[PDB]
Amino acid sequence: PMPPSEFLDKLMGKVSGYDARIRPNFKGPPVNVTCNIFINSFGSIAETTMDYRVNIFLRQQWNDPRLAYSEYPDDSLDLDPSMLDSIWKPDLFFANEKGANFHEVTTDNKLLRISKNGNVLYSIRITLVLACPMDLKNFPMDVQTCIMQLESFGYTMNDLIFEWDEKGAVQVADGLTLPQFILKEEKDLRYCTKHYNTGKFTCIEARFHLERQMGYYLIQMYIPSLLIVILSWVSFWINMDAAPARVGLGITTVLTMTTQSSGSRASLPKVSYVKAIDIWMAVCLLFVFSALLEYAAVNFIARQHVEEMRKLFISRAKRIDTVSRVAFPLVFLIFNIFYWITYKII
Amino acid sequence: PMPPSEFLDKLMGKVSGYDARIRPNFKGPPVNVTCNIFINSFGSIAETTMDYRVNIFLRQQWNDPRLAYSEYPDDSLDLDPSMLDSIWKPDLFFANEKGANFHEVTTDNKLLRISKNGNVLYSIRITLVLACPMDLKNFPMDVQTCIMQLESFGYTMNDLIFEWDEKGAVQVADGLTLPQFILKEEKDLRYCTKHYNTGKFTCIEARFHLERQMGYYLIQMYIPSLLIVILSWVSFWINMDAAPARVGLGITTVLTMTTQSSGSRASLPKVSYVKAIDIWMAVCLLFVFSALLEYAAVNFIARQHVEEMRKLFISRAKRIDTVSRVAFPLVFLIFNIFYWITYKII
Amino acid sequence: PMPPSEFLDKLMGKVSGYDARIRPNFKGPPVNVTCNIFINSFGSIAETTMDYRVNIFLRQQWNDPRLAYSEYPDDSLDLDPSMLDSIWKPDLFFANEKGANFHEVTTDNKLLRISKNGNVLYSIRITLVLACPMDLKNFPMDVQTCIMQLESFGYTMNDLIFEWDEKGAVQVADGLTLPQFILKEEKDLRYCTKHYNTGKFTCIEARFHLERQMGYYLIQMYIPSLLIVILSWVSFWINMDAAPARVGLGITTVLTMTTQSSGSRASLPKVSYVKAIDIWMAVCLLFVFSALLEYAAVNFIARQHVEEMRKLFISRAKRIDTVSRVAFPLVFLIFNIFYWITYKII
Amino acid sequence: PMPPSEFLDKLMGKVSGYDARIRPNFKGPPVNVTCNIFINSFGSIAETTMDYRVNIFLRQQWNDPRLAYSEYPDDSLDLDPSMLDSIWKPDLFFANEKGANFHEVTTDNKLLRISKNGNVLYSIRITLVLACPMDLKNFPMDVQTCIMQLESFGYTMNDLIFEWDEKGAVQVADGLTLPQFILKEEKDLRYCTKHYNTGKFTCIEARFHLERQMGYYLIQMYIPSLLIVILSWVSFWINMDAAPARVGLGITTVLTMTTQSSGSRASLPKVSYVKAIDIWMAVCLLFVFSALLEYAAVNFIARQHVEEMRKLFISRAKRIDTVSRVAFPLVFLIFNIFYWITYKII
Amino acid sequence: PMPPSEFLDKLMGKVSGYDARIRPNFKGPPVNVTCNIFINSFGSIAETTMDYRVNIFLRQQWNDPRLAYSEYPDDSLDLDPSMLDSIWKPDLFFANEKGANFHEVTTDNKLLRISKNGNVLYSIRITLVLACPMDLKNFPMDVQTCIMQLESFGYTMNDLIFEWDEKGAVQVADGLTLPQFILKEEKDLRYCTKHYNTGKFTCIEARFHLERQMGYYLIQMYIPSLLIVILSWVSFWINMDAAPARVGLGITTVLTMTTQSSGSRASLPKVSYVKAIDIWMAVCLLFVFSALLEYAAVNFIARQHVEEMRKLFISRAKRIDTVSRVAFPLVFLIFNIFYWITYKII
Ligand SMILES: *[C@@H]1O[C@H](CO)[C@@H](O[C@@H]2O[C@H](CO)[C@@H](O[C@@H]3O[C@H](CO)[C@@H](O)[C@H](O)[C@@H]3O)[C@H](O)[C@H]2NC(C)=O)[C@H](O)[C@H]1NC(C)=O
Ligand SMILES: *[C@@H]1O[C@H](CO)[C@@H](O[C@@H]2O[C@H](CO)[C@@H](O[C@@H]3O[C@H](CO)[C@@H](O)[C@H](O)[C@@H]3O)[C@H](O)[C@H]2NC(C)=O)[C@H](O)[C@H]1NC(C)=O
Ligand SMILES: *[C@@H]1O[C@H](CO)[C@@H](O[C@@H]2O[C@H](CO)[C@@H](O[C@@H]3O[C@H](CO)[C@@H](O)[C@H](O)[C@@H]3O)[C@H](O)[C@H]2NC(C)=O)[C@H](O)[C@H]1NC(C)=O
Ligand SMILES: *[C@@H]1O[C@H](CO)[C@@H](O[C@@H]2O[C@H](CO)[C@@H](O[C@@H]3O[C@H](CO)[C@@H](O)[C@H](O)[C@@H]3O)[C@H](O)[C@H]2NC(C)=O)[C@H](O)[C@H]1NC(C)=O
Ligand SMILES: *[C@@H]1O[C@H](CO)[C@@H](O[C@@H]2O[C@H](CO)[C@@H](O[C@@H]3O[C@H](CO)[C@@H](O)[C@H](O)[C@@H]3O)[C@H](O)[C@H]2NC(C)=O)[C@H](O)[C@H]1NC(C)=O
């Protein structure tokens, strides 16, 4: 017999009329390319740019009847990646690329094998920086849906149709963890067929659901925003005579709370709508600012203090501290129930 | 019959005299290239660099009478993108590129089809980082106009003329949203014909209007700049005896206001002129600094306090707190009306 | 005799049937490629991205019986790196590349020599940015294990098998130091054989253990977090009459401690779990917040002060300062023993 | 007649002996290349890196007598940019490149036309990141001089001489504005002929003067550094009895002034010399620190207060507040005159 | 005669047997390549990455007896940089590259001339980002030694030997200044011959000494760390009765000093050892913290005050303020002498 690279030069050379610019089944039914991906790495999900970097193995399988040998005795013929300019390949691209590249270290990372009946496996390694629009209406408790979609570019729907295969169309690597998110195991697979004025082009896509990990935000920006509210409660257990204390406590807490509010959106996109970390800060702004306005009611009623009625005006000024010691730590707990039930329903 | 790639080698080969370095209609009328773009992605509109990243499909259509076949029975002949060095193509470029690249993942993202009469469609995918000069005179309420312009580089006006087509010269993708801006639906299309000492070169351009979303700035830098003004009002409801309080309230507010003023321009270009976020901070600097100077009038008139006249000097010192409780929250509201009417007219 | 480049064109030319697309020992036993690396540079171990940049010399040795000359008198024949497209080479790649490149300054940095029996040495220079998942459960005292793994891409296990050689499979450069870490001298070498639906592909890997240097974190974020706890102790040595002092000391310390807590995770990945620098800050939050609640017990018992019993209520209010001067600096030392024994066992 | 690309293959082919490796007028007088640039974009003038990004059209004109046709009837023959490897071109480079690239979007952005007598116009588009050493001795009021210089690399002075042309050697685009600087209209043009041990190489250069816009620094770092000085003046209008006030005012101002001093050099190169923004901060450090030392003279003379002499010692302690209310706002204005006259002369 | 490019095709063509893959003096003595560099630009010496960017002209001279013409009448023959693949060139590389690139703007920046006896000058332009390990034990007063080393990659010591030439082996450009450092004029030149298991490879290197400019650190982080120590001295000149003052002065200074300590290492590598800017901050931490503990001794001895003995206990409490006004500004000056003599000896 003869070696396969000399045998594949007979299948692809000047003889046999194989022309690599012409799709299989020409002037016939369209080419049914079936696809599946294998996610090696995932992550660096930025939100300022609203993008995420994935690192996939893109496998494509089609049928090319001109490559159907019957004399060489094997069942699969590998190609050198140097000879990948010699067969037809589908012009797949990603409709939200935002920059992508191959991997060409120590060899082009490309695989190509040809079965006997003409089935062609073609596996390459791609690094993508895909774009997904973030929806941050409920921000530490959101379930993002970042997608990726695989169109054709030169061939219309009556020449080339993409399909996901039925045998596990999206595999994920074995120990693929993410720092901030978790990747849910149910991955949607649906069509996204595009219509332009050039024609109608095929498109398949895969949705990935990325549920967050709330445990980070629960440590940096919910509990230190809950202690400073309790500092504003301890002004109530000091008498109406340490005026440099209860004012100075109602100033340093309400102005370290503004730093918490501005520091809550340090690395976020400047979205117009109000998000679920903003109706925690702008309500805990309100509790630490109502503790300062409580003392400004005490020291104003007390300075208004005729003997008999003003002894009750001092007693009116102590009756308001027998209420705000109980009202504020049991209205803030009513809000703390209406908040966490709202975002564990929506 | 014969397959089209063998047929197009007859239209472009050594026979028939087709020379890819020579424009259509040579020594004749100029080539009327008509253009339209399709914006896939838009955004990352930085203002430190004053640029924005767009991701377009650039379609070009011209007429090439040497490619007018009449024997092959179809109506459109696709090319392989490998054979794009074999026809004439217009040397379009972007006059404010600032860096740009093609997309070459799994295939060169290029499309080329040739009709029977010689009409050539040519669609490529480009990522641009275009430069637009920002005008930030009224900064959270501005309507930017960031443009893009498509010149020729080697052919003058008497050889190649660009036109926008009449059938929707700028399409935008279906769900294209922006984080900070909104893209207005009216897009200007006008000529920008350049004159150099080399010649006069054709140019068409498209204006994009990018109205901001004020809802972000309304949460971070208008309301926390409006609470700290109200902290400087609560010094008035404390008597002229808590000297560590009303001074300490007129210091911490007026120096957390400087942090608001410096934090207002954290990620902005260092422009020379004064912008609409600066005449909100440098007026709310003035209200929280006039509350400190109000107490320095109280505690100086009171320390000046002969029995009969100085009892009115204490009463003069309380008459000024029966005025500044009403004057300052009803002069700040007069400014708050003159401000928001001014920037919802201009 | 004749020069070696004319001699190697006899070994690789049109004569002798050497085909560079066909592995050695075709239709036979697999090719035993043996590998070892030489780490020139190491480091820039980022944790936001969870990656590290290495700069290696990748040596590969296999056996190619078609290159076994016997007439030329030397024992080793170098190649020009221009003629590296003319022999077979293993298609090694790194299964966690995340971007990598060759070095091509003044010459392609590639080495290739061929012995007499057919042994082929092949040494190239690669810069890698490898991905390793960080485990930060005990963060300033952790021993990371960042790995690198060398698969095949086109050849399955029955065609190409990777091995580490027995003579020092991972060398490290002479004075290779790291800024933050130290590289332990025991390096694990184990197999990582992959199974896909394409086939089973060979894989070898090398574990690197990266023990940190605790001496940085001991200066920035343990001792300044230990002085501010001692500032909250000095409130106890001031009487229950300087109410602007002991409150103002129990506010500035407990709110500069929040800046220490937020500044503790300035450049860290937003992990969900709680790490060993967080149960030092959120316990030293508790000591500086219990010094403020100690005074709120003193000034509330003292303001509650009938002649005989209230003289003991003042004495009850001084008995609590004869306890908290000794309890708090000898409970914080009990925690300071339970902490550092826990993370010098785990 | 025949088309020009077939005509230029007669001027440059195997016939006529045109060799693209050999300069015009060989073994004769040097080639007089004349140059002029056209600045499309300018800016991103960083000072940490001390570089600036320019985007030019580099036009070069020389004379090549071997390209002097006389039979083809036109007056100018364009080239395809694909055929730019076929004539001689000057090996110009930029002696302070620091990285540069061409622009190759939709076509190589290169222009080449050949007149009848042999004059060759050659216009390319380059993006440069040029290096200019910043001189920051007087920092918000400095006039930078950032240059660019165009040497030869392989040909010495007796083979190739660069010249600026007399007809406007540096053009600037129509609406080219800069965010921080303004580009003065007088641009110096002078020679920079280099001497190495290889030979003497030609060099021309163009100076650009970049006067700043002081209006940004006048809003962020001169007026907020002028209000905090006036806060330190308002300690004088409070009596010598509010010891928590005048000390607390002489501490918060003098320590928010240190943040102004460190925030003054947030994004500057760490230069050794003292600059004009540093002798404004380190003098306004001195005024807000002399207001604290003024009170430490008052409360120390007052606590030193025998009946008759100490009544004047209280009166000595009020005589010092009848001086520092007028001395400090009329010594700070003497400095404010010596400062702004000094940097509007130098 | 005939032009040199036709003459050099006779020296390098199919005739004369010149093979560009075979070094000069084959099967003979090694090739003595002599080198010297010319530093155009230097700097951007980062310390987070521990690297520095240099921009050199690398000149190499060797002897190639096959290029020794004797008939053409000149003394030097330039090459086109297009014909640099036609002679032998040494495979030099930089053993600490960390990324490097050529410069290819308007022409490949390469020079090549061949003398009559066969001497070959070869000058290229390279941008390097070289790695140097920083030693920061004495950080604002350190003399770094950042090196660069030039190995061979494919040829061992018995085939190719690098040498520095005796006539000024490292030139520096005329006005090369650095922002933070100064480049000392004595540059060490020494051998660095490497031994691997492949062989022994030649290596030469050049040390550069980079003495810092202390004048920046003397303005930002020594004098503002020296004023805050003097603020902690002014607590001594206020009596033991303004308890909100001397405590509030011993809190704001000792907690703005922690910001100085954390801000001292904002842009530094996280090294384990203690550096000379850290034993200035952590000693000026100690002086501003001993001023707070001095008042906690005063107000505790005074509150301990039977008539006769306690009048001396008040006098004991004023005797400690007649000592700490002189002890602390004359112990801090003893440290300020032991510090600056220590780092101007080491
Ligand atoms: C690629 O896959 C497509 C399906 O997505 C195939 O298209 C379909 O092919 C059938 C022939 O097998 C076409 O004919 C139909 O046959 C059924 C009987 O099986 C008959 O009941 C129908 O009336 C019709 O005649 C069918 O129209 C066609 N559908 C479309 C939408 O094109 C295609 O054949 C596959 N091509 C290859 C090369 O595998
Ligand atoms: C490309 O489009 C341009 C228009 O932008 C065409 O130029 C114009 O072509 C006409 C011929 O159709 C020229 O002749 C004019 O004809 C009218 C009658 O239709 C006559 O009234 C005028 O006096 C004149 O003779 C016209 O001068 C020309 N205009 C310009 C500015 O060049 C051009 O023909 C188009 N080329 C192709 C190949 O489609
Ligand atoms: C590459 O290395 C592999 C080992 O990883 C070699 O595979 C082994 O080769 C032996 C022949 O030397 C095969 O035959 C065995 O021989 C022993 C006697 O030595 C006999 O007791 C066994 O029953 C068996 O017949 C062995 O099966 C094979 N093992 C595997 C897993 O393939 C291989 O030969 C090496 N190839 C080259 C080109 O060096
Ligand atoms: C390129 O430009 C240079 C000038 O920068 C030209 O060099 C000068 O050329 C003249 C000939 O025209 C040389 O001869 C001189 O002629 C004058 C009379 O015109 C005579 O009085 C002098 O004594 C001398 O003979 C002159 O030496 C030469 N100068 C230099 C510095 O080389 C050059 O000819 C131009 N080349 C081309 C191809 O245009
Ligand atoms: C390149 O430079 C090396 C030196 O680094 C040259 O190597 C030395 O060459 C001499 C011949 O000139 C060798 O022979 C010695 O000659 C002296 C008399 O001059 C004699 O006393 C010694 O006993 C010895 O025979 C010498 O061994 C050799 N040294 C080494 C280390 O190789 C080399 O010749 C130069 N090559 C070229 C092409 O310039």
Residue A244 contacts residue B245 (beta carbons within 8 Å): yes
Q: Which of E152, E153, E170, E171 is nearest to E161 (CA)?
A: E152
* Residue E228 per-residue DSSP state: H
Nearest CA in chain E to C53: E98
Number of Cβ within 10 Å of residue E99's Cβ equals 17
Residue A114 DSSP SS3: strand
- Rounded to 5°, the CA angle B146-B147-B148 comes to 140
Distance CA B141, CA B211 (A): 8
CA distances (Å), D283 to each of D254, D277, D288, in order? Answer: 12, 10, 9
Nearest CA in chain D to B295: D238
Question: Ligand 1, from A117, A159, A161, A163: best to mutate by most atoms within 8 Å of Cβ?
Answer: A161
For residues E74, E80, E86, E87, the Cα torsion angle rounded to the nearest 10 degrees is: 50
Beta bridge partners of D252: none
Q: Which of D72, D67, D176, D159 is nearest to D122 (CA)?
A: D67
- Between helices C224-231 and C243-262, what is the axis angle to 10°? 160
CA C65 to chain centre: 42
For residues A158, A162, A167, A169, the Cα torsion angle rounded to the nearest 10 degrees is: -160
> Which residue lies with its CA nearest to atom 7 of ligand 5?
E29
Q: Which of D14, D20, D159 is nearest to E5 (CA)?
A: D20
Q: Tokens in use for C287?
A: 């000591």
Residue A25 contacts residue A34 (beta carbons within 8 Å): no
Strand B160-164 with B194-195, pairing:
unpaired
Residues with Cβ within 8 Å of B5's Cβ and at least 6 positions away in sequence, in order, are: A19, A21, A22, B80, B83
Cα of A32 vs centre of ligand 1, distance in Å, is 11
CA distances (Å), E153 to each of B95, C112, E86, E94, in order? Answer: 45, 10, 20, 9
Q: Tokens in use for C115?
A: 């012995």
* Residue E229 per-residue DSSP state: H
Determine if residue C106 is left, alpha or beta; phi over 0 gives left, psi from -120 to 50 gives alpha, anything else beta: left
Q: Which of E93, A82, E98 is nearest to C104 (CA)?
A: E93
For residue D219, which phi and psi values (nearest 5 degrees)?
-100, -40
Burial D70-96 (b: 16+ CB within 10 A, else e): eebeeeebbbbbeebebbbbbbbbbbb
* Residue B249 per-residue DSSP state: H
CA distances (Å), E234 to each of B270, D304, E336, in order? Answer: 39, 16, 19
- Exposed, middle or buried, D126 (CB in 10 Å: 0-12/13-18/19+)? buried
Resolution in A: 2.9
* Residue A16 per-residue DSSP state: G
Method: cryo-EM
- Rounded to 5°, the CA angle E280-E283-E286 comes to 150
Distance CA E113, CA E121 (A): 5
Helix (H), strand (E) at residue B77: strand B76-78
Residues with Cβ within 8 Å of D338's Cβ and at least 6 positions away in sequence, in order, are: none
Residue D41 contacts residue D10 (beta carbons within 8 Å): no
Q: Which of E276, E292, E275 is nearest to E228 (CA)?
A: E292
Q: Tokens in use for E257?
A: 């000093």
Determine if residue D243 is left, alpha or beta; phi over 0 gives left, psi from -120 to 50 gives alpha, anything else beta: alpha
Q: Tokens in use for A310?
A: 């003003």
Distance from CA of B318 to the nearest CA of A (A): 13
**Do the Cβ atoms of C5 and E21 come within 8 Å?**
yes
Q: Tokens in use for B213?
A: 């979303």
Number of Cβ within 10 Å of residue D246's Cβ equals 28
Q: Tokens in use for C254?
A: 């407990």
Amino acid, single-letter form, for residue A204? I
Amino acid, single-letter form, for residue C1? P
For residue D113, which phi and psi values (nearest 5 degrees)?
-135, 145
Distance CA E235, CA E297 (A): 13
Q: Enumerate neighbours of B (3 or more CB pairs within 8 A).
A: A, D
CA distances (Å), A29 to each of A93, A120, B2, B226, in order? Answer: 22, 18, 19, 68
Number of Cβ within 10 Å of residue C14's Cβ equals 7
Distance CA A217, CA C262 (A): 11
- Between helices B224-231 and A243-262, what is the axis angle to 10°? 170
CA distances (Å), D126 to each of B86, B323, C259, D84, E227, in order? Answer: 27, 67, 48, 16, 51
Whether the CB of C269 sits within 6 Å of ligand 3 = no
Cα of B29 vs centre of ligand 2, distance in Å, is 8
Q: Which of C106, C132, C105, C110 is nearest to C121 (CA)?
A: C110
Distance from CA of C36 to the nearest CA of E (A): 11
Whether the CB of D99 sits within 6 Å of ligand 4 = no
Place of tokens 């109706």: A279
Half-sphere exposure of A60 (CA within 13 A, CB side): 26
Distance from CA of A306 to the nearest CA of C (A): 26
Distance CA D76, CA E104 (A): 29
Question: Ligand 3, from C32, C62, C120: best to mutate by most atoms within 8 Å of Cβ?
Answer: C32
Distance CA A226, CA A283 (A): 11
- Exposed, middle or buried, B308 (CB in 10 Å: 0-12/13-18/19+)? exposed
Helix (H), strand (E) at residue A12: helix A4-12
Distance CA C210, CA C145 (A): 6
Distance CA E281, CA E117 (A): 65
Residues with Cβ within 8 Å of C17's Cβ and at least 6 positions away in sequence, in order, are: none
Strand A160-164 with A194-195, pairing:
unpaired
Distance CA D271, CA A291 (A): 48
Helix (H), strand (E) at residue D211: strand D203-212
CA E170 to chain centre: 17
Beta bridge partners of C43: C53
Number of Cβ within 10 Å of residue A134's Cβ equals 22
Distance CA E16, CA E7 (A): 12
Query: Is B222 annotated as a binding-site member?
Result: no
Q: Which of D91, D207, D203 is nearest to D150 (CA)?
A: D203
- Between helices B278-302 and B308-319, what is the axis angle to 10°? 160
Amino acid, single-letter form, for residue A21? R
CA distances (Å), D55 to each of D36, D125, D170, in order? Answer: 14, 7, 13
Number of Cβ within 10 Å of residue E263's Cβ equals 15
Q: Tokens in use for D162?
A: 């660069």
For residues E284, E289, E291, E296, the Cα torsion angle rounded to the nearest 10 degrees is: -170
Q: Which of D223, D215, D220, D213 is nearest to D336 (CA)?
A: D223
Distance CA D208, CA D186 (A): 8
Beta bridge partners of E57: E38, E125
CA B213 to chain centre: 12
Q: Which of C210, C61, C32, C68 is nearest to C133 (CA)?
A: C210
Place of tokens 């509990």: A223
Distance CA D244, CA B245 (A): 9
Residues with Cβ within 8 Å of C305's Cβ and at least 6 positions away in sequence, in order, are: C313, C314
- Exposed, middle or buried, B323 (CB in 10 Å: 0-12/13-18/19+)? exposed
Cα of C180 vs centre of ligand 1, distance in Å, is 63
Q: Which of D149, D145, D156 is nearest to D58 (CA)?
A: D149
Ligand nearest to the CA of B24: 2
Q: Which of A176, A170, A172, A179 is nearest to A212 (CA)?
A: A179
DSSP string covering E101-127: EE--SSS--EEEEEESSSEEEEEEEEE
**Do the Cβ atoms of C175 and E262 come within 8 Å?**
no
Distance CA B1, CA D193 (A): 68
Place of tokens 């002060």: C305
Residue E22 contacts residue E92 (beta carbons within 8 Å): no
Determine if residue E106 is left, alpha or beta; phi over 0 gives left, psi from -120 to 50 gives alpha, anything else beta: left
Distance CA B155, CA B160 (A): 6
- State the Rg of chain A over Cα: 33
Place of tokens 């006896």: E117
* Residue B251 per-residue DSSP state: H
Cα of D160 vs centre of ligand 4, distance in Å, is 13
Q: Tokens in use for C207?
A: 């574990």
Write the secondary structure of E143-207 as one string of H (helix), E (strand) and C (coil): EEEEEEEEEECCCCCCCEEEEECCCCCEEECCCCCCCCEEECCCCCEEECCEECCCCEECEEEEE
Distance from CA of A212 to the nearest CA of C (A): 9
Burial C67-84 (b: 16+ CB within 10 A, else e): bebeebeeeebbbbbeeb
Residues with Cβ within 8 Å of D142's Cβ and at least 6 positions away in sequence, in order, are: D135, D136, D212
- CB-based pocket (< 6 A), ligand 2: B 25, 29-30, 32, 161
Distance CA A309, CA A315 (A): 10
Half-sphere exposure of E111 (CA within 13 A, CB side): 22
Residues with Cβ within 8 Å of E314's Cβ and at least 6 positions away in sequence, in order, are: E302, E305
Distance CA B101, CA B108 (A): 12
Half-sphere exposure of A121 (CA within 13 A, CB side): 18
For residue C181, which phi and psi values (nearest 5 degrees)?
-120, 170
**Do the Cβ atoms of D253 and B254 come within 8 Å?**
no
Residues with Cβ within 8 Å of E10's Cβ and at least 6 positions away in sequence, in order, are: E16
Report the atom number in ligand 2 closest to the C-alpha of B63.
38
Place of tokens 């997904």: A132
CA distances (Å), A196 to each of A156, A199, A204, B61, B220, in order? Answer: 10, 5, 16, 15, 41
Q: Which of E320, E293, E316 is nearest to E305 (CA)?
A: E316
Cα of D29 vs centre of ligand 4, distance in Å, is 8
Give B74-78 contacts, CB < 8 A, sequence gap 24+. B74/B4, B75/B115, B75/B116, B76/B113, B76/B114, B76/B115, B77/B4, B77/B7, B77/B8, B77/B113, B77/B114, B78/A154, B78/A155, B78/B4, B78/B111, B78/B112, B78/B113
- State the Rg of chain C over Cα: 33
Q: Per the annotation, where are the binding residues of D for strychnine?
A: 196-201
Residue D276 contacts residue D138 (beta carbons within 8 Å): yes
